[PDB]
Every structure is written in structure tokens, then in C-alpha cells.
Amino acid sequence: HLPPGPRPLPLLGNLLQMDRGGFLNSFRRIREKYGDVFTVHLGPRPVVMLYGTEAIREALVDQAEAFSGRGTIAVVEPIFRGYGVVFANGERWKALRRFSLVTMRDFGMGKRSVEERIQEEARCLVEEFRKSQGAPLDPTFLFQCITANIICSIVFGERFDYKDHQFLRLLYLFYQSFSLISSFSSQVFELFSGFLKYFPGTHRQISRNLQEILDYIGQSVEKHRATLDPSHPRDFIDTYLLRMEKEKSNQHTEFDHQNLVISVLSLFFAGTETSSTTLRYGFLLMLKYPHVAEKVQKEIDQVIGSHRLPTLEDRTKMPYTEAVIYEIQRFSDLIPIGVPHKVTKDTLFRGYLLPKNTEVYPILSSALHDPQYFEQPDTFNPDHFLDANGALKKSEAFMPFSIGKRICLGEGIARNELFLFFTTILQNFSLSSPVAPKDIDLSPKESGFGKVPQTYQICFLAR
Ligand code: HEM
Ligand SMILES: Clc1ccc(-c2cnc[nH]2)cc1
Ligand SMILES: Clc1ccc(-c2cnc[nH]2)cc1
Ligand SMILES: Clc1ccc(-c2cnc[nH]2)cc1
């Protein structure tokens, strides 16, 4: 009944079958041979694998409700412990997500605005960037400090100075925590947590960092409830917290302490590594195609220019910018395996039958590179999102944020985040790196199922 695949080893499953090349080309091969949606047994864990725009969509969109449930990710779970909105299933999920959305958009007025807030951080990014002035520098950390700062602003209410002792001792972790989750002993744990639960090692060390972050969060929440002003709701914490008051009249409501605290935690968990990486890779790309950055730099001017602040109402009158912004995302393909779904009920897909909770990885990477929707699917080439008359050409296969009932909660936030950060830099300061444009290597340093670009250095020559 389950979709077809490679016969597993009875204990490891196919984890041996992977190593052969990349742990994703391994998948490529195990398409027909086996087709477009197959199963693989990771460890002892049966996993369906939607592969390729059409197959992904058909399931995740046209059967969206069935496929909308969140899969197991056992390593970081012992903490997230099934709360908050990445990681909830059930009504809890359909309700926290409902909250979280209403609470942006109607985050404006005020103040501030997510927009104003990103610009505020941008002013700062530029400001901090000007200081080096020709002097080359790995901007992989200020990209992590600017991405992370935004989330702070939203959840905590204010942005930290980069130099800040808490912020730093918090940014590390996050990124180390990330680093650890993406290590061999984590991957093993992910699959055999049942066994390795009981013995020490990086799965604990991971949870201890996250625990720390929580005690900060929970701490900040008191401070928030003390200072709490029902009239001026400072941020997410506040707004939740006041909504929480509202629910005092319900014997059994769903907005309890730990859905707040862990959500806050999750927001960070989502809103940092990825959106920073995409910027790193963004600038790195701009370097290898120094003219694409030029073509944008001219467009930057025509529509904005010398003085004012770059505004969201720009991208609409700037196709290339956004086109580029898309190709940066398509190409860099930063979540390649998507984040685990599982089906809510037994479910009928393409004739096969997946029992309740059968896990399913939407292999989007297969969609950002889908040969059916793009041509030189493997090269960086913005004309992937242009047409002949060089206006935007959106594509049903571009889904870096996933697709359907689950699509990335902070998609908007990031979509904007990229745009401004990208334009507000490229407004001020022209990329120039020691590394020769001829052969910049877009190879990632490593994957750990999370490519990060080979570490790099460029200068920022102003105006
Ligand atoms: C370009 C950078 C980003 C990418 C590529 C990205 C991508 C994704 C993807 C692919 C998913 C999986 C949806 C699924 O399969 O269930 C997701 C989920 C999620 N992401 Fe993002 N994301 C980005 C930035 C952010 C930011 C900035 C935030 C916070 C502001 C965020 C918050 C979330 C949340 C809360 C979920 C859980 C959705 C749910 O199941 O309710 N992400 N993201
Ligand atoms: Cl090249 C390669 C390396 C490691 C794995 C792996 C991770 N977890 C189990 N096996 C697979 C393929
Ligand atoms: Cl385990 C996990 C889940 C979701 C994300 C994410 C969503 N949006 C951006 N990053 C990252 C890591
Ligand atoms: Cl099985 C599995 C799937 C996805 C991840 C991931 C994606 N982004 C960060 N971590 C980790 C482990």
C-alpha cells in the first residue's frame, strides 16, 4: 500500500543506500528507478518523499488538509516538546498559526511596523558597514545579527546593539545549537533517539543551549508582564499575553504559558539561520556576477536614488531586483529537503495508502531546480524570473518557503527582509572582493543537510 521504494536493511533501512554521492542525489537516483513519490526508511522511520513540483503540489496543495500535519524531528523535540508554531499539530497548530498571522499585518499602527523596523536595522547595517571602508570582511555575522535582530524587535519589542553582551551570548548559542543539530551524532540521534536518550552526548549539549535561551525568554516575559501596558502592546509577547488575559474566561483554552514561551523560541529558530544564509549567499552571488549587481544597482537608482529610505512599495516598480531576489533563493535552495510533514488521517495519494502520521518530506530542492519549470536550472540566472519584456515572471515551482497549509509563517517578513537589506546595502557601497570573480566557489563549506556557502570576503566601497 505504501509508495514503492528500495528494500531496506531491517535496522538501518536505507541509510547505507545514501552515502553513494550526496544525500540528495542519492534521492535523485532513487527516483525512477522508483518514480516521483517513493518511500525510504531512514533509520526505522518510513518516509514518503514527494519529488518534483507537480508531485509536491498535487499532495501538499490539492490534498492540503491531509498533508498539513507536522512530521517528527526528534533531536530538537525534547525541548520544543510539541508546542508552539512550527511544531504543533492539531487544533493547537491551526490556532496558534491563526493568532500569529493576525498579529502581523495588524502589527502596524503602532508603532512601529515590521517595515520601519527592518529599515531601522538597515540604517544600522549600513552605518556599521561604512566603518571598515575598503577593508575586506566576512559579513556572515552581521547578516546573522541583522536577521536575528528583527525577530527580537517583533517578539521582544526592541533591537539590540550588535556589541551587546546578552545578544551575543544568545546568538551563540543559536547558531552553535544549529551547528550541533547538524552533526553526525545528531543525525544518528534523530533516528535512534529511543536508544540514545539515556546516554550523554551532543543531543543533551544541544538541549542545554536551547534551555538557556528559554530561561531568557521566560525571564523577558515576566519583565513584560510587570511592565505590561494593555493600551500600548509592545510586541508579540505583550499581544499574546493580553490575548492570554482575554482567555481567562475559558475553562480550557489553548494560549497557555508554554505556547507563548516556546513559540517565541521557535520564531527565532526559524527566523535566523536561513534568512541570514540567503543573504550571505546573496552577496556572494552578486560577487560572481558583479554586473547583475550592477543591473540592479542602476534599477536601485531609477526608482529610489540618492537620499530617501528604500521602501516596500519599490519591488513592485523594480522587476529585476526581485527577480534576482528570487534567483538567489531558487539557486541557493537553502531548505532542500523541506521541513517534515506527516499525514493527519490515513490518506489516499496517487493510489498509494499512507496510514495516519506516515511521515512525508516534500523535496522542494527538486522544484527550485525542476527542469520542467526552468531551463539552466542549475546555473544562477535571473532570467529564470523574467520574461522577454523583462517584467517579473512568477513561477509555480519557486516555493523556497514550501507550499500549502503549512507554508512558512514568516514568509512576508523574510521576503521583505531580503529586499530592503539587499537594496539598502546596494544603494550605499559597491561590492569588491579579493577573491577573483573568475572562480568564486559556490560549493557550500559543508551540508549537514543545510548547505552554507564557502566562507568569503568582500569590501564595501561607498556611494
Ligand atoms: C528565505 C528564508 C526562509 C525560508 C526559505 C523559509 C522556509 C520555510 C519552509 C520551507 C518552511 C516549511 C513549511 C512546511 O513544510 O511545513 C517554513 C516554516 C516556518 N517558518 Fe520559514 N523560512 C524562512 C524565513 C523565516 C522567517 C524570517 C521566519 C520568522 C519570521 C520563519 C518562520 C517559520 C515558521 C513559524 C514556520 C512554521 C509554519 C507552520 O507549520 O505553522 N521563516 N519556513
Ligand atoms: Cl555521505 C553520507 C554521510 C553520512 C550519512 C548518514 C547520516 N546519518 C546516517 N547516515 C549518509 C551519507
Ligand atoms: Cl527544524 C526547522 C524548521 C523550520 C525552519 C524554518 C522555517 N522557516 C525558516 N526556517 C528551520 C528549521
Ligand atoms: Cl530529518 C531532518 C530534516 C530537516 C532538518 C533541518 C532543516 N533545516 C534545519 N534542520 C533536520 C533534520
Side-chain angles (χ1 to χ4, degrees), residues 1 3-6 8-19 21-22 24-27 30-80 82-97 99-100 102-108 110 113-122 124-126 128-129 131-162 164-168 170-172 174-196 198-247 249-250 252-294 296-297 299-306 309-316 318-329 331 333-355 357-358 360-375 377-382 384-392 394-402 404-430 434 436-437 439-446 448 450 452-453 455-460 462-463:
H1 271 236
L9 295 51
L11 275 303
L12 318 169
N14 314 81
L15 304 183
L16 299 200
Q17 276 97 291
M18 294 302 141
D19 61 279
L24 188 99
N25 289 337
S26 44
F27 287 135
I30 309 167
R31 181 177 181 170
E32 226 135 34
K33 196 129 180 215
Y34 291 104
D36 279 322
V37 52
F38 46 90
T39 60
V40 175
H41 304 88
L42 283 43
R45 180 192 304 205
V47 184
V48 192
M49 293 264 181
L50 312 169
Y51 190 100
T53 176
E54 198 195 53
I56 277 163
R57 288 206 130 173
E58 195 178 322
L60 283 209
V61 195
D62 282 311
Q63 297 212 54
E65 204 79 59
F67 283 95
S68 64
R70 171 64 65 195
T72 311
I73 89 190
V75 49
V76 85
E77 174 277 20
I79 345 167
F80 288 89
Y83 287 107
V85 271
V86 175
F87 273 118
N89 280 305
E91 196 62 46
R92 183 185 280 158
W93 175 76
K94 273 168 181 164
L96 291 199
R97 195 219 166 66
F99 178 92
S100 301
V102 176
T103 204
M104 317 306 200
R105 300 288 182 268
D106 289 345
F107 197 115
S113 177
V114 70
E115 193 191 24
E116 298 161 352
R117 264 144 210 268
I118 301 187
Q119 292 170 324
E120 199 201 344
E121 191 63 39
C124 288
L125 187 275
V126 157
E128 194 65 33
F129 255 98
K131 298 169 76 206
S132 318
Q133 31 130 280
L137 65 135
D138 199 346
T140 191
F141 157 91
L142 284 163
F143 290 177
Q144 326 161 285
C145 299
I146 55 176
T147 65
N149 227 353
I150 302 167
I151 314 301
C152 305
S153 197
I154 307 176
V155 300
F156 289 133
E158 89 209 1
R159 76 161 187 99
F160 300 102
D161 318 279
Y162 314 129
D164 168 61
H165 78 282
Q166 326 192 245
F167 183 75
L168 285 177
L170 189 299
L171 256 166
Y172 280 101
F174 262 119
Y175 287 73
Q176 177 179 1
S177 293
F178 301 146
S179 156
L180 299 197
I181 302 167
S182 162
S183 82
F184 182 64
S185 39
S186 308
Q187 278 146 271
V188 166
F189 186 95
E190 178 49 47
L191 303 158
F192 308 128
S193 58
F195 198 93
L196 297 196
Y198 295 87
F199 307 75
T202 78
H203 64 92
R204 284 204 224 296
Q205 173 51 27
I206 272 154
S207 161
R208 295 171 235 197
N209 292 338
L210 275 302
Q211 191 51 278
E212 194 165 326
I213 303 182
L214 295 174
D215 306 343
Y216 186 77
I217 293 168
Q219 216 256 345
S220 154
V221 172
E222 295 302 320
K223 311 202 143 224
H224 268 58
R225 180 143 64 217
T227 307
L228 191 289
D229 185 330
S231 310
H232 300 298
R234 301 199 282 286
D235 54 58
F236 182 100
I237 293 171
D238 267 17
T239 195
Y240 185 94
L241 257 163
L242 295 174
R243 167 85 207 249
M244 185 145 47
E245 184 61 23
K246 195 174 229 271
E247 307 281 284
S249 77
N250 301 334
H252 53 235
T253 49
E254 191 67 57
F255 281 99
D256 58 6
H257 182 84
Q258 293 177 154
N259 273 330
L260 184 275
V261 51
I262 283 162
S263 281
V264 192
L265 185 271
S266 313
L267 264 304
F268 275 107
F269 210 71
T272 44
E273 159 65 6
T274 300
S275 42
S276 171
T277 296
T278 178
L279 282 153
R280 297 158 64 182
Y281 249 124
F283 281 99
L284 178 70
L285 281 174
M286 296 297 103
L287 273 288
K288 193 160 178 69
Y289 295 96
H291 39 262
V292 172
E294 282 156 20
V296 171
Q297 268 203 44
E299 192 176 21
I300 302 281
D301 283 28
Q302 291 174 301
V303 195
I304 314 169
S306 282
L309 275 303
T311 61
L312 273 289
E313 65 249 75
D314 274 319
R315 53 162 53 137
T316 195
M318 304 161 72
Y320 206 72
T321 311
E322 204 169 351
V324 164
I325 304 200
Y326 287 17
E327 257 290 85
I328 296 166
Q329 301 228 87
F331 179 90
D333 198 295
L334 295 67
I335 305 149
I337 196 74
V339 50
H341 287 237
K342 64 153 137 147
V343 290
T344 86
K345 55 161 206 272
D346 306 70
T347 176
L348 192 285
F349 191 50
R350 291 208 179 181
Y352 318 95
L353 174 284
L354 295 53
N357 308 264
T358 301
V360 50
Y361 303 163
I363 309 167
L364 321 93
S365 177
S366 44
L368 289 65
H369 294 109
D370 181 81
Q372 216 175 355
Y373 285 65
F374 307 123
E375 293 177 350
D378 290 312
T379 64
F380 179 77
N381 185 11
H384 279 156
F385 301 104
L386 275 303
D387 62 84
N389 272 120
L392 295 116
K394 301 190 170 255
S395 205
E396 321 267 7
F398 181 76
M399 44 194 36
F401 294 99
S402 188
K405 288 275 162 163
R406 278 288 176 150
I407 197 179
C408 198
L409 188 55
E411 172 208 341
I413 292 174
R415 284 268 321 119
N416 311 318
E417 181 178 13
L418 295 198
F419 184 81
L420 312 170
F421 280 165
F422 195 76
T423 52
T424 322
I425 291 161
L426 271 193
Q427 192 183 238
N428 274 110
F429 333 56
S430 286
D439 55 283
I440 297 181
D441 199 37
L442 316 159
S443 300
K445 197 184 39 47
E446 299 167 74
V452 300
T455 195
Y456 77 81
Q457 295 185 0
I458 71 188
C459 307
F460 273 60
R463 152 79 145 154

